[PDB]
């Protein structure tokens, strides 16, 4: 008998990525971009988008020839074969989801409390543990149910943020928008663009779902490209409104719910509540997509060296212990570091993943096509942004610097241990057609 997976259309895939991207940038890390970038935030989103499109150049070329739910791990194995590098990168991919869950946990709390509450290390942890555990339990009753609502939640929050843009363009303060020129603000804008690389993390949910996407050779590259452009214009369109309606120092003060307060001067409490409600569900749908679509896929891949040919995406479909591990280390990253920390580690983990993808594109450039000049250029740009991020933490928050360095080593060390015990190998079964199908 023939089994077949439920396949996603182009726009369902686009919506999925747009959802996680908006939930991670607009409603989560916006406060960290207020402090570091200031009035130069619209430029930060443009600059981060440029980095993303250079990475997209590699992803779209590779994703048009190499189809796999393994995502970037297929590209890497097609390039440098099976080894501890490839294996550590697959665990790193799983980690990218783990740390993102922490990022969403903090963002949720940042809009939950100022809606219903004090703000402290204990109250934050309570709101964080409570929302993660709810999604951990959602596997057993309603992860599929929320997953069916994801497409609607995205359309609504786009209308919510869509009114936020055009209604804000009547009450703008053009004097607060005009870009800063001072060196410390310019370098601050550049430093923020490094932490805001994660703002375009749609690469993960699309490629890890590529075999569950209709006409994947066509619709995966398209989804990645369309999805970046939508959020880039949304980011900028929102960033201008927020800064040109509230003093930036008040936004740094009210960091955790930056957009909630920024609506009050021009929409009232009807707008405040709308942005607060719109934020919670935005993050909710982003978490559901990250855990049930991303983390579950990346975990089984790192654990087994391959993925099942047939599985339900919107539940933890295999190795349930991984669900709790993903949820646990998701809290362990939200407990230690603050929003700046989590965001900094997230971008660092993503960049190393992207660096090896651009390298894979270069190794396989004869097979997949593209210009060598652009690939080499993309590699250097991403490498520089990565170093800038590491240099920033080295001097600003050295605890986060060691938090980043330990992760890459810890992931590398665990891979050595895992490959010794289990002997797990990665095979081309990730991307080679199953013969029966």
């Amino acid at each position: 008998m023939e089994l077949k997976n439920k396949k996603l259309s182009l726009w369902e895939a686009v919506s999925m990525a747009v959802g996680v991207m908006i939930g991670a940038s607009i409603f989560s890390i916006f406060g960290v971009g207020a402090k570091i970038a200031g009035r130069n935030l619209p430029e930060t989103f443009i600059l981060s988008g440029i980095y993303a499109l250079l990475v997209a150049y590699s992803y779209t070329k590779l994703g048009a020839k190499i189809v796999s739910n393994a995502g970037p791990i297929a590209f890497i194995h097609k390039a440098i074969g099976d080894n501890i590098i490839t294996g550590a990168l697959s665990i790193l991919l799983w980690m990218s989801y783990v740390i993102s869950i922490a990022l969403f946990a903090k963002g949720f709390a940042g809009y939950f409390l100022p809606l219903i509450a004090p703000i402290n290390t204990f109250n934050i942890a309570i709101t964080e543990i409570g929302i993660v555990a709810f999604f951990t339990a959602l596997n057993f009753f309603g992860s599929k149910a929320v997953g069916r609502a994801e497409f609607f939640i995205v359309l609504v929050k786009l209308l919510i943020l869509g009114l936020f843009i055009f209604a804000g363009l009547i009450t703008i303060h053009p004097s607060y928008v005009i870009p800063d020129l001072a060196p410390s603000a310019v370098s601050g804008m550049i430093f923020a663009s490094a932490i805001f690389f994660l703002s375009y993390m749609g690469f993960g949910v699309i490629t890890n779902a590529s075999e569950h996407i209709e006409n994947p050779k066509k619709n995966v590259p398209r989804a990645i490209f369309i999805s970046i452009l939508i959020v880039m214009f949304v980011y900028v369109g929102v960033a201008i409104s927020a800064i040109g309606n509230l003093p930036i120092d008040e936004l740094i003060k009210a960091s955790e719910n930056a957009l909630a307060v920024a609506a009050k001067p021009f929409l009232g409490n009807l707008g405040f509540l709308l942005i607060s409600i719109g934020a919670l569900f935005s993050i909710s749908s982003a978490m559901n997509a990250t855990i049930y679509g991303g983390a579950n896929v990346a975990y089984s891949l790192a654990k087994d060296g391959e993925l099942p040919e047939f599985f339900e995406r919107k539940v933890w479909f295999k190795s349930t212990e991984g669900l709790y591990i993903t949820s646990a280390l998701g809290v362990l990253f939200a407990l230690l570091f603050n929003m700046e920390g989590v965001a900094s580690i997230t971008s660092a983990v993503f960049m190393v993943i992207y660096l090896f993808v651009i390298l894979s594109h270069y190794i396989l450039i004869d097979e997949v096509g593209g210009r060598k000049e652009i690939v080499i250029f993309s590699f250097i740009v991403v490498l520089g942004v990565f170093l800038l991020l590491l240099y920033y933490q080295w001097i600003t928050n050295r605890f986060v610097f060691y938090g980043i360095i330990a992760t890459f080593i810890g992931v590398l060390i665990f891979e050595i241990i895992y490959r010794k015990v289990t002997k797990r190998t990665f095979s081309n079964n990730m991307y080679v057609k199953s013969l029966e199908s």
């Epitope: 008998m1 089994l3 087994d304 047939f310 599985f311 339900e312 199953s434 013969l435 029966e436």
Partner: antibody, heavy 124, light 114 residues
Framework: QVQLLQPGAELVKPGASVKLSCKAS????????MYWVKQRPGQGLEWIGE????????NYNQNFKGKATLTVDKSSSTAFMQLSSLTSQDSAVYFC?????????????????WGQGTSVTVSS | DIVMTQSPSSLAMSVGQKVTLSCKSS????????????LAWYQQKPGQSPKLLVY???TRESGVPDRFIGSGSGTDFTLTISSVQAEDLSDFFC?????????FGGGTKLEIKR
């Protein structure tokens, strides 16, 4: 195209053991269950147990707990069934059979592709 | 364990004739959320492996003649052979694919009259 290779016959002495082999081809071995089925002459079919070839998870029919042990080898796409301390009762035809998995769902599936079965004969 | 019961024991039919084989289970094979019945039908020709005919109560396996029709739900199931052919001579086994341990019925033998 999809097939499971089983040796035709095995002769074994009472008290000894056999490792019956089931070689898969035409499909991704670790994406489907492997079931095993016992048929004695003039009798119906009895499901011995199951193995997930990806992580070696097993589940046995209570009647064969301690009698049969299921293992796989992933590289060779081969499923094995070991039968312990063989008696006259164990002489029969043993089938391996594929079964669709579909992870994270409530669907269980019957057996779509079967081996030709190994007729095991327990004799001195 | 789920007990599977088949009826009748054996039947002798000439070519073109219609027969209805029945299969009964001690427990419902209907998944309340799925709305699917986890019952399969097989054909075993003498000296051969069982061949899957029907699964989920009513879906014919690829390549199986239209003459075989499965129906029923809950505990009572049917395999209709609308026009038995010379080749159909065999044992027909039902199997619940609902719950482990998976269990088969004892079978119905079909022999051909001529």
């Amino acid at each position: 195209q999809v097939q499971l290779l089983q040796p035709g016959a095995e002769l074994v002495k009472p008290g000894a053991s056999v490792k019956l082999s089931c070689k898969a081809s035409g499909y991704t071995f670790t994406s489907y269950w492997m079931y095993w089925v016992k048929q004695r002459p003039g009798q119906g079919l009895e499901w011995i147990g199951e193995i997930d070839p990806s992580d070696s998870y097993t589940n046995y029919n209570q009647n064969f707990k301690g009698k049969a042990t299921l293992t796989v080898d992933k590289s060779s796409s081969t499923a094995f069934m070991q039968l312990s301390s063989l008696t006259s009762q164990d002489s029969a035809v043993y089938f391996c059979a594929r079964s669709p998995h579909y992870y994270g769902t409530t669907y269980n599936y019957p057996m779509d592709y079967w081996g030709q079965g190994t007729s095991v004969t327990v004799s001195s | 364990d789920i007990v599977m019961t088949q009826s009748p024991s054996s039947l002798a039919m000439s070519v073109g004739q219609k027969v209805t084989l029945s299969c009964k289970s001690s427990q419902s094979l209907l998944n309340t959320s799925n709305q699917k019945n986890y019952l399969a039908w097989y054909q075993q020709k003498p000296g051969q492996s069982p061949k899957l005919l029907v699964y989920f109560a009513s879906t014919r396996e690829s390549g199986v003649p239209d003459r075989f029709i499965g129906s029923g739900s809950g505990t009572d199931f049917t395999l209709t052979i609308s026009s038995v052919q010379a080749e159909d001579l065999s044992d027909f086994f039902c199997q619940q694919h609902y719950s482990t341990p998976y269990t088969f019925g004892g079978g119905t033998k079909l022999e051909i009259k001529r």
